[PDB]
Design a protein around this nucleic acid. Structure first.
Ligand SMILES: [Mg+2]
Length: 156
RNA sequence: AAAUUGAAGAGUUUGAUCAUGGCUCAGAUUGAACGCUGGCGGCAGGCCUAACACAUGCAAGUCGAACGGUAACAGGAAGCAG
């Protein structure tokens, strides 16, 4: 029912004639726990405002994910520029074995049993982007059946 | 019947950013040592260095059913003296 959680809040600076201008960026992630997950990156002069902006962004532009019984559909890799991510379905009771950002994104998405690792850069925004991309691309057996022109029973 | 149920990151370069890239940390372990402290038990372990030098005691004897035998001991026998 739209569970949301803020991964990282980071202070960034701009320089002007006067001096430095600080502002805050908030990376949040929302999801319905049934497949839908979406991340948002808001910027404002103060943290709460930034978070609100991020939340609105995340709530819009969500994406559907094919989940098989609260777990992944197959082992999937994902990249986004520096962040290359691996995530593998695991037996019921394994829990989310996943990094920071990754854990958040998976949890809001609704995966209950995963084995993840973040290779490459572990920059939260890029890592979240990578995970969402991987989750999105991951197809289900009904999808493969549709593509190949067979029944799901012939493929298994 | 069961005996692979298995994979987490963080700090640190920049006014800020992403990347590269090192350093550091979170875990487990030990024939450990040192500091402070210290009640009991169970089960293990205990010269990693000088294969350096070694006082002293012990760590390989046994068989008389292989053999001459009796140093003893322990006993009887024969000779005896009270
Ligand atoms: Mg030695």
């Amino acid at each position: 029912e739209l569970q949301e959680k803020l991964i990282a809040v980071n202070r960034v600076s701009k320089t002007v004639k006067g001096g430095r201008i600080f502002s805050f960026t908030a990376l949040t992630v929302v999801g319905d726990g049934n497949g839908r997950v979406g991340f948002g990156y808001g910027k404002a002069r103060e943290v709460p405002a930034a978070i609100q902006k991020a939340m609105e962004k995340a709530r819009r532009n969500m994406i559907n994910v094919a989940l098989n019984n609260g777990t992944l559909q197959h082992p999937v890799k994902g990249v986004h520029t520096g962040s290359r991510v691996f995530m593998q379905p695991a037996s019921e009771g394994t829990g989310i074995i996943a990094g920071g950002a990754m854990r958040a994104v998976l949890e809001v998405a609704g995966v209950h049993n995963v084995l993840a690792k973040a290779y490459g850069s572990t920059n939260p925004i890029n890592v979240v982007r990578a995970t969402i991309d991987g989750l999105e691309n991951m197809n289900s057996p009904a999808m493969v059946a549709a593509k190949r022109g067979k029944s799901v029973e012939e493929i298994l």
